[PDB]
Design a protein around this nucleic acid. Structure first.
Ligand SMILES: [Mg+2]
Ligand SMILES: [Mg+2]
Ligand SMILES: [Mg+2]
Ligand SMILES: [Mg+2]
Ligand SMILES: [Mg+2]
Ligand SMILES: [Mg+2]
Ligand SMILES: [Mg+2]
Ligand SMILES: [Mg+2]
Ligand SMILES: [Mg+2]
Ligand SMILES: [Mg+2]
Ligand SMILES: [Mg+2]
Ligand SMILES: [Mg+2]
Ligand SMILES: [Mg+2]
Ligand SMILES: [Mg+2]
Ligand SMILES: [Mg+2]
Ligand SMILES: [Mg+2]
Ligand SMILES: [Mg+2]
Ligand SMILES: [Mg+2]
Ligand SMILES: [Mg+2]
Ligand SMILES: [Mg+2]
Ligand SMILES: [Mg+2]
Ligand SMILES: [Mg+2]
Ligand SMILES: [Mg+2]
Ligand SMILES: [Mg+2]
Ligand SMILES: [Mg+2]
Ligand SMILES: [Mg+2]
Ligand SMILES: [Mg+2]
Ligand SMILES: [Mg+2]
Ligand SMILES: [Mg+2]
Ligand SMILES: [Mg+2]
Lengths: 150, 56, 110, 142, 48, 103, 117
RNA sequence: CCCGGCGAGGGGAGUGAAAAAGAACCUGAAACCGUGUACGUACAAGCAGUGGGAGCACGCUUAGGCGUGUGACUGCGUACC
RNA sequence: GUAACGGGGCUAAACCAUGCACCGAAGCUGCGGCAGCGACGCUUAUGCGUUGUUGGGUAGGGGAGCGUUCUGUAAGCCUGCGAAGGUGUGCUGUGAGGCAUGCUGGAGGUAUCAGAAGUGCGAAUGCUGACAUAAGUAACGAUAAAGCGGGUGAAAAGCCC
């Protein structure tokens, strides 16, 4: 707190409470007693605990029929309108699409769809597998994830 | 010299029980001009007991 | 009909203005004006002007009947106090209060 | 159901005459306080004067035991420093005889308003005559 | 298995003590430090 | 016509048509209770005093109501000792309608 | 995550102040005074839940003694007679009978006098 | 437009969804200060409550010893940290 | 100031003995209810027709919870057919508290399960602001001194002449 170190008043003889700093946390405009600093909130996840949770999540999507598997997930041109029809024909609204290879047309076509997210097999994270209602994984993506996790 | 305790709202009102003002018990009326005035005082137009002993 | 008149931010404490207002509570307005005319207080000058204004409002904005009117409700409320510094001996500053009042008069024919 | 409480608007108080001739002051005073309080009544409610009115005749002839006629001292203070005043039993009997039984009974009653109120129903007389014949008071032997 | 149906294992997340937060807590007033010594004092305690 | 009976650790002096509130009973609202251990019967002139009980005395009562009584706060406080404890309480009751007294 | 305390503080104060209705002065208006008057009332009440039982019994007995004394016997002998007569009518009900049914009480007194004779 | 000193301030009118948003202006708590109504209080002694409890007022109930406010009288009772 | 039974008063209402009755506590019992610690038959993620016992408590240790703001769940759910906040009322929970609802308010609030804390104030001669009290009290600052007439003005002891 910006200000001086001067005693606001003398220790004794005034009937006032003893003070030492205009910046005391007791005082209005004073300092915060345990003022926050920047801090890193990140945690260590053990390598095996993360893979172990990914395997658990995927198993639970299979049990809950939230995992859809397809040979391919192709949009021809980069248009939401073509993809939104595909997902309406596949009966899908909120869905994480997991391809093996980044298709430029598919990432773009899905960017403006808030409930759709298209990732590579390497882009999976545990939250997005839980967060979306359905997970659609290409056959080749199943291969990658199986080799990643095993 | 000074109080050891704050006196209450109630003690304050009890002290003020004699602070009410008395109103004029009656105004008097002039026999000639009909003005109301304080008894034994002149009227605001200058009359006392019916006589006009002021200029105004 | 009831008819209000108020004088807000009147330069007097409510305690003083109250002494006078208590003299005319529930009284014929003719009788109150004569109690206020011969009451030797500054607050009566303030109160009488408010009562006069209430009468006039009751005439011009409501119906009629000076003689039917009566002082139904009269109360003084504390208004905002002005704060001033009064130098006392030995550099001690006392903060004195210039207390205002909100005078309100209500007058009714019924 | 909630237990009965007497109501002083509906409470019935009867009138009694008592003679004090020959009777021990304290022994007599206790029965009056009992009756003045309403303890003898099943409708006794201790915040309610359920008691009865009593007339005491011949207060001048109440008896005391031992040497108490000469040696029982009634003390009172005036509220002025040094104002501790004395009176024996026989000087009181001589000057204000009705006070001897009234002081004894006041001591035996509750302290407070109701106790002060119960005491009003005691009418003490130094002689054999009272002027409350209109109240139709019954004789009571203590 | 959704973002609002994930609990921790029972016993894995103990509360955490909060000192000087009243009578009911059991750590109010002196907050477990007892009364009037070096150990009570802020930054109070003899060295190892 | 009144009778004295014990139900819930406590004695009640009741008459026909009196709702009496007594401690919780394990009886439903569509049911009748028999307080057969009655201590007194008075007809106005005939008064039968149970030596322990009125041999043939029986009180037939219908169960009208179960409910929780009026909330009562329990406050424990030890001044200067950093101790205070607050507890609430509602006492269950059974209200019974006295339908008949019989010697 | 800064937390303003005003809404929860106002409630905590209002709860006490509502409990202090009817109290004189600062006791119904001021939280510092009010909180001490509510806690004291609680302590007294708790004390009074027990005290009431002692007071009511004290009343019943004085009422029973008067009736019993009226009907010819002290309370002490009367309760002994009802004991030796196996009568289990409690003091609450004897005192109700003494007031509202004076002939029933007379019967209970003769029964006590009998079991003492 | 009206009272008022060509005042302060206020009452109407009009604006506006709202002026119970009028510039001393969103919301508008508390202390504190008042007006009004109900109940109590001028023979009464103390942490001012608590338990009991009349009476009065106001609602309820189709009568029903229950509800709200007040609280005479009475038992107990010397605040908090 | 009685003031060396607490008082009244007591010749027992004192004392000694001999007894029988009563009062007397939050002790014991009785009725109803909560919780902890054990131990038990059916049977089982046990909870009970059950059973036994415990349950005053500072420092202090242990255990389980309430609520507050923020993050996710949430581009969802509630909300101008009235959010938060404020103020009453009713109901409810062992408690912190919670639910509903009138009035005000006039636009935001947020279940659930998790997550993170500037997370709960009556005290610190605490800090800031606001408002009391004393009190309509003291005082209005040199004891060089004012008085009248006229004027102006809503009003003149104080201004003008
Ligand atoms: Mg700062
Ligand atoms: Mg790594
Ligand atoms: Mg100077
Ligand atoms: Mg006493
Ligand atoms: Mg402890
Ligand atoms: Mg300390
Ligand atoms: Mg020490
Ligand atoms: Mg230590
Ligand atoms: Mg104007
Ligand atoms: Mg505003
Ligand atoms: Mg305002
Ligand atoms: Mg009186
Ligand atoms: Mg006094
Ligand atoms: Mg006392
Ligand atoms: Mg002496
Ligand atoms: Mg003996
Ligand atoms: Mg007991
Ligand atoms: Mg016990
Ligand atoms: Mg039990
Ligand atoms: Mg314990
Ligand atoms: Mg115990
Ligand atoms: Mg918010
Ligand atoms: Mg609201
Ligand atoms: Mg504070
Ligand atoms: Mg503290
Ligand atoms: Mg003074
Ligand atoms: Mg003076
Ligand atoms: Mg002076
Ligand atoms: Mg001067
Ligand atoms: Mg002049």
């Amino acid at each position: 707190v910006t200000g001086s170190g001067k005693k606001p008043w003398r220790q004794k003889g005034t009937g006032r409470a003893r003070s030492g700093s205009i910046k005391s946390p007791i005082w209005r405009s004073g300092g915060v007693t345990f003022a926050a600093r920047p801090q890193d909130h990140s945690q260590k996840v053990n390598k095996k605990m993360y893979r172990g949770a990914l395997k658990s999540i995927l198993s639970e999507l299979v049990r809950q029929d939230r995992l859809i598997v397809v040979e391919k997930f192709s949009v021809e041109a980069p248009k939401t309108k073509l993809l939104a029809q595909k997902l309406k024909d596949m009966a899908l609204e909120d869905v994480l699409i997991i391809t093996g290879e980044l298709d430029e047309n598919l990432f773009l076509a899905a960017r403006n769809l808030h409930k759709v997210d298209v990732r590579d097999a390497t882009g999976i994270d545990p939250v997005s597998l839980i967060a979306f209602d359905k997970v659609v994984m290409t056959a080749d993506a199943v291969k990658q994830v199986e080799e990643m996790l095993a | 010299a000074v109080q050891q305790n704050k006196p209450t709202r109630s003690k304050r009102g009890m002290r003020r029980s004699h602070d009410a003002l008395t109103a004029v018990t009656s105004l008097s009326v002039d026999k000639t001009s009909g003005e109301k005035h304080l008894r034994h005082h002149i009227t605001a137009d200058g009359y006392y007991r019916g006589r006009k002993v002021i200029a105004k | 009909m009831e008819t209000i008149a108020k004088h807000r931010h009147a330069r007097s404490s409510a305690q003083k203005v109250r002494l006078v207002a208590d003299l005319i509570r529930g009284k014929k307005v003719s009788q109150a004006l004569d109690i206020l005319t011969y009451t030797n207080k500054k607050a009566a000058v303030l109160v009488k002007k408010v009562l006069e204004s209430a009468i006039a409002n009751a005439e011009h904005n409501d119906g009629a009947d000076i003689d039917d009117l009566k002082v139904t409700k009269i109360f003084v409320d504390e208004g905002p106090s002005m704060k001033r510094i009064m130098p006392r001996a030995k550099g001690r500053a006392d903060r004195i209060l210039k207390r205002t009042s909100h005078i309100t008069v209500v007058v009714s024919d019924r | 159901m909630k237990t009965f409480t007497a109501k002083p608007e509906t409470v019935k108080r009867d009138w009694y005459v008592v003679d004090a001739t020959g009777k021990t002051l304290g022994r007599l005073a206790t029965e009056l306080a009992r009756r003045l309080r309403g303890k003898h009544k099943a409708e006794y409610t201790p915040h309610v004067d359920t008691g009865d009115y009593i007339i005491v005749l011949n207060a001048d002839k109440v008896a005391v035991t031992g040497n108490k006629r000469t040696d029982k001292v009634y003390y009172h203070h005036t509220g002025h420093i040094g104002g501790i005043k004395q009176a024996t039993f026989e000087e009181m009997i001589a000057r204000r005889p009705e006070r001897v039984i009234e002081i004894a009974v006041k001591g035996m009653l509750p302290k407070g308003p109701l106790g002060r109120a119960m005491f009003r129903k005691l009418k003490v007389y130094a002689g054999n005559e009272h002027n409350h014949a209109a109240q139709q008071p019954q004789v009571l032997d203590i | 298995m959704r973002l609002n149906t994930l609990s921790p294992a029972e016993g894995s997340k103990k509360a955490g003590k909060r000192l000087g937060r009243g009578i009911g807590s059991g750590l109010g007033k002196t907050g477990g430090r007892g009364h009037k010594g070096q150990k009570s004092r802020s930054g109070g305690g003899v060295r190892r | 016509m009144y009778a004295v009976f014990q139900s819930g650790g406590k004695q009640h002096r009741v008459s026909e048509g009196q709702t009496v509130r007594l401690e919780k009973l394990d009886i439903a609202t569509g049911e009748t209770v028999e307080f057969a251990e009655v201590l007194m019967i008075a007809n106005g002139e005939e008064v039968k005093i149970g030596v322990p009980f009125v041999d043939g005395g029986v009180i037939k009562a219908e169960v009208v109501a179960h409910g929780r009584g009026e909330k009562v706060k329990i406050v424990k406080f030890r001044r200067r000792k950093h101790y205070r404890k607050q507890q609430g309480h509602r006492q269950w009751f059974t209200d019974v309608k006295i339908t008949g007294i019989s010697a | 995550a800064r937390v303003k305390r005003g809404v929860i503080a106002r409630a905590r104060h209002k709860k006490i102040l509502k409990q202090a209705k009817g109290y004189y002065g600062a006791r119904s208006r001021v939280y510092r005074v009010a909180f001490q008057a509510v806690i004291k009332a609680g302590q007294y009440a708790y004390r009074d839940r027990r005290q009431r039982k002692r007071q009511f019994r004290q009343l019943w007995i004085a009422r029973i003694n008067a009736a019993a004394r009226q009907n010819g016997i002290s309370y002490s002998k009367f309760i002994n007679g009802l004991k030796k007569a196996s009568v289990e009518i409690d003091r609450k009900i004897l005192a109700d009978i003494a007031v509202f049914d004076k002939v029933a009480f007379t019967a209970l007194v003769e029964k006590a006098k009998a079991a003492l004779a």
